[PDB]
Design a protein around this ligand. Structure first.
Ligand SMILES: C=CCN(C)C/C=C/COc1ccc2c(-c3ccc(Br)cc3)coc2c1
Ligand SMILES: C=CCN(C)C/C=C/COc1ccc2c(-c3ccc(Br)cc3)coc2c1
Ligand SMILES: CCCCCCCCOCCOCCOCCOCCO
Ligand SMILES: CCCCCCCCOCCOCCOCCOCCO
Lengths: 619, 619
């Protein structure tokens, strides 16, 4: 039956593999990437008329009937995203009249205008002079003086927030303004009567931080700021030391852009670091066949490759298939062997992790490292020496990364401070990197492959963590993947792999929850709204990936030979395309719950293949 | 008569001009450049068999009958240079037997062996483990803590020494060893009976520094060096901030190589600065037609271009010649507009200088700046706006650069400390950058072109400086050009340009000295030995450049219509080649008096043309 579905999915995957031996699907997000890019180009005075064009098609192409842009496809209109896209277009050439500009503007006004947008959005506008800097939450260079163990030192922030904070302190230190031509000024963003509905800090704003900010804005007005000169150079040096190989900073859009702006501010346009950071941008860009151009928030080569392998294996290909060897070899050359920001909390821990992107040595993450190591553990490569060795380093590193609650974060250990969540500046996404169910699950499943079972204390401490984090209805939150279907799929699969008994009560209570959300069409789907409103948990249009996730949960829990089970397999078999792939018009990836969603292009092909590969196993 | 010589020389220079509009002659030095390169490659584990070959041909080709290499062509065998070349060859493949290896080896031994070589040479050997680190003068990272105004803070060193000191403190901090294969070990460098004739610090070694070093090597042995971690990072950041656009450091061989080694030491071979620093090297390399390959100690594009223009103008071409405009435009794009290390002593001084090489913004020098500005002053470019403006900036920068004694240094103001000259480490070349007669002269002649005569206090203070520095016999030392013929030529030409009276006693006493050293063959020549033994001052085989220098001195002093005068013109007119150029098998350039000499490839063509252009003027 499905066997053909598999043979067809397999050959399709293999056809997507690049020459070097890896897989690399693009990463989808929202238009703030390209919108901010346009603005960046203006700040750096490096505008390419042809590029703007391609960007205009894209922005428009992405706008909806109502004239707005959302975070995820088929989602509620987003203010910030729409404001930024609006300004972007007006600068590229559009007139506030044109149909699109019209629809958007009205939606923006019906929301309280610019005064209701996240800090970033107001900050960008502040940068081109369309918003007073005084009203933007202040982050001082002096934050660079806080010690390793102090309230709000930069290492109390998540890796992704950290670099941004550093780069920004330099920018906010100078509060520079790069005026836009009159043709693009957007005063109309204020022209509204609706009351400005301000978004506050993630965890609520104590009156302390409120005061402190006003404080800082006042100090900012003084004529002399002693040691500021030094605080800046401190930040700069911090940035210069960490620049990634591709010229980015962390391989993520934000800090990269801010860092570049900051160098511009410091008259360092013709310094090696600036030049490289600038040229690097192109690698993250993508030519859209309909004429547009988009910029990736980040890139997932390693990750894509890692899952690719595992899927193709669980599928059927030989642990030494010459095409998988190409990948295995490639992966080995990726292993990070030098200290990263994580060493600040683990000085005696030997380097051995992996990054998400191509060349980002200071920020390996547990998730990638776990999947990669495990994927390798399933291959037989020529140099069994290096494979054995690689694995062991990565493994040890993963173990040394385990946090205090027996769980695993993504980039740091016990990056669980609560302080950062209350600053006025932090009103978007996550700011800290605490342990999560999905990463912890992936780790356990990694160790699982090696055989380490529930006996080992490390594994237990972790299971205890998961057991305590389970939800009332028996599901598990999905931190980096939409959502409960993603998490529950992870945990169960993991627990199964570490020897735990699939028959336990809590396990059964999870599998039940799964069968319970199967859509009429036989598959499963969970919409990104499930982060904002619970009624959506496990509810949504069926997708190949999410279906594949629920299947893995079922296959692991023994219910492989179920109705719901065989039912979901049908869905995949039917919905598959002639070429072997699958379609998926919905995002199944999560950047920040409720704030930033991602579309992992390869998910639709790899997870269905891995789920099917594992079903063919249960028989 | 000579008119043809000029026409011929002119069209020749014009044929040497690159497309972009500049001139760029190679820079000759000695084999330690290529020898150190070989070693560098070994340290970085990046050896290209093919390149090694090209370097062997070169090394050999440069060796002399006696089996030694000298600093300047036709000079006494140099120990350090020969030791380094020896080791280089042995590593590339030579056997201690072969004729070349034998002759060299014996010369080395007849000198006390390795124990008689400069610090650098022993250090390089220490790096590959052929010499104990304990016996190498120690320079600690902690030097990074001395304040702006303190004994031996890094800004008390000359720009070229500074960067090296920083990069090295990191290296000496770790005292790393990169072993050579047994095949190349050079124990035989010790096998000698002759007493080791040790070279001491430039200005003498007080017993203090002697003790201090011993102190440091002791502290080096401790198990804990508090804050060293930070001293290193201070150095690292200092380097990271100053890397040049081409990836070099200062556009000079030394620090660039050391910095690269230092990054390697810190596991930063995957960092942008290193990759760029590494790829940058190729630009300084040069394919030799006989199969060899050489590496330039530095590059003189700006300088060459600057003089090229002036010569072609004084010769005759129109101030708006389309071919000179190409140059003028090019030069404008070169002006440095950001703070350099010089700002540490001139914070309120506006940037406006120029560098020697292509892209080296933190180290513009007075010499280049003066020649460039002045050369522009002689042109008529399309955008008279930028020309007017640029000049002004440069001018101001030059003025603000004048030191305490009315003289001008090269890179810094009053970089005249005496402390650095006594450290055990500093046994090679110059370590400080004090004012010199030639630079000061070039500056005066620059201003001179504008009009600013002796009235202006600036000019006077300077003339006073020169007047006091003149030698007993009426000559002027040549700091960056071999030597008295170079300096005296500069000064006199300058003084003439600033309105002074060529008839004065001291002026006449100079011109006389000139006429007095004219060689029988009608030309002038001064050998590089004139830095070690006075009997050589103004003595040596005639060269096109030095002849052209003495001519400018004579033409300026009114004695243009002299015997010696017309006599020297003959020399040039005759010795000139059929193509238009001139030959010059001798170095006329000076890096460090008595320690490092340079061959300016373009000198032989430009100065003769400029001297001839100025003779055609006196009629
Ligand atoms: C899929 C598995 C998740 N696991 C953990 C691997 C790591 C993935 C990379 O995680 C991120 C995490 C954050 C980001 C951002 C981003 C976007 C906007 C802001 Br504001 C800040 C960061 C852009 O790309 C990102 C990628
Ligand atoms: C011709 C005019 C001189 N004027 C002033 C312009 C500046 C020229 C650059 O001066 C230098 C000055 C020093 C160096 C070194 C060098 C070589 C060995 C060591 Br050790 C240290 C530096 C290599 O190249 C150099 C070039
Ligand atoms: C000069 C110290 C070299 C020793 C490196 C250990 C650094 C420990 O990391 C602590 C914080 O820095 C995070 C890592 O990325 C650092 C890059 O800087 C490179 C070498 O200092
Ligand atoms: C963050 C301060 C930036 C202002 C620096 C100017 C300081 C005065 O110059 C001191 C000497 O250092 C030379 C500066 O240029 C080198 C690179 O350092 C980068 C920031 O300017």
């Amino acid at each position: 039956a499905y066997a053909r579905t598999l043979d067809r999915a397999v050959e399709y995957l293999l056809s997507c593999q690049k020459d070097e031996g890896y897989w690399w699907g693009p990463l989808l997000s929202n238009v703030t990437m390209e919108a901010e890019y346009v603005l960046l180009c203006h700040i750096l005075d490096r505008v390419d008329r042809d590029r703007m064009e391609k960007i205009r098609r894209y922005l428009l192409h992405e706008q909806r009937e109502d004239g707005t842009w959302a975070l995820y496809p088929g989602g509620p209109p987003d203010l910030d995203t729409t404001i930024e896209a609006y300004v972007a277009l007006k600068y590229i050439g559009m007139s506030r009249d044109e149909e699109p500009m019209q629809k958007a503007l009205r939606f923006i006004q019906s929301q309280g205008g610019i005064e209701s947008s996240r800090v970033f959005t107001r900050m960008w506008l502040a940068l081109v002079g369309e918003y007073p800097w005084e009203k933007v939450p202040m982050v001082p260079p002096e934050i660079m003086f806080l010690g390793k163990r102090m309230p709000l030192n930069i290492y109390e922030f998540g890796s992704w927030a950290r670099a941004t904070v550093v780069a920004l302190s330099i920018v906010m230190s100078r509060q520079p303004v790069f005026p836009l031509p009159e043709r693009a000024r957007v005063p109309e963003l204020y022209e509204t009567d609706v009351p400005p509905r301000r978004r506050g800090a993630k965890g609520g704003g104590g009156w302390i931080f409120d005061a402190l900010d006003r404080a800082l804005h006042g100090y900012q007005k003084l004529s002399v700021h002693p040691f500021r000169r030094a605080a800046e150079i401190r930040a700069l040096d911090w940035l210069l030391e960490r620049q990634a190989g591709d010229g980015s900073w962390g391989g993520i859009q934000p800090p990269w852009f801010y860092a570049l702006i900051a160098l511009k501010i410091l008259d360092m346009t013709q310094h090696p670091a600036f030049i490289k950071g600038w040229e690097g941008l192109e690698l993250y860009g993508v030519e859209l066949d309909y004429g547009g151009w988009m910029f990736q928030a980040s890139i997932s080569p390693v990750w894509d490759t890692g899952l690719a392998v595992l899927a193709l294996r669980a599928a059927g290909l030989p642990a030494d298939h010459d095409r998988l060897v190409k990948a295995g070899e490639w992966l080995l050359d990726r292993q990070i062997t030098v200290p990263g920001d994580w060493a600040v909390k683990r000085p005696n821990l030997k380097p051995g992790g992996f990054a998400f992107q191509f060349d980002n040595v200071y920020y390996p993450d547990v998730d990638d490292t776990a999947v990669v190591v495990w994927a390798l553990n399933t291959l037989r490569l020529p140099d069994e020496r290096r494979r054995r060795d690689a694995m062991t380093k990565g493994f040890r590193w993963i173990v040394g990364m385990q946090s205090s609650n027996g769980g695993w974060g993504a980039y740091d250990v016990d990056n669980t401070s609560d302080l950062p969540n209350h600053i006025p500046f932090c009103d978007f996404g996550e700011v800290t990197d605490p342990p999560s169910e999905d990463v912890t699950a992936h780790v356990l499943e990694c160790f699982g492959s090696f055989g380490y079972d529930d006996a080992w204390k490390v594994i237990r401490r972790a299971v205890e963590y998961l057991k305590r984090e389970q939800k009332p209805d028996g599901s598990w939150f999905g931190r980096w993947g939409v959502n409960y279907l993603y998490g529950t799929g992870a945990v169960v699969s993991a627990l199964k792999a570490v020897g735990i008994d699939t028959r336990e009560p809590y396990i059964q209570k999870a599998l039940d929850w799964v069968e319970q959300h199967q859509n009429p069409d036989g598959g499963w789907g969970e919409d990104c709204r499930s982060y904002e409103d619970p009624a959506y948990a496990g509810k949504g249009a069926s997708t190949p990936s999410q279906t594949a996730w629920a299947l893995m949960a079922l296959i692991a829990g023994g219910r492989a030979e179920s109705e719901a089970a065989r039912r979901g397999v049908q869905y995949l078999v039917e919905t598959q395309r002639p070429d072997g792939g699958w379609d998926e018009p919905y995002y199944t990836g999560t950047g920040f719950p409720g704030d930033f969603y991602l579309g992992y292009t390869m998910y639709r092909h790899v997870f269905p293949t891995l789920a099917l590969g594992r079903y063919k196993q249960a028989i």
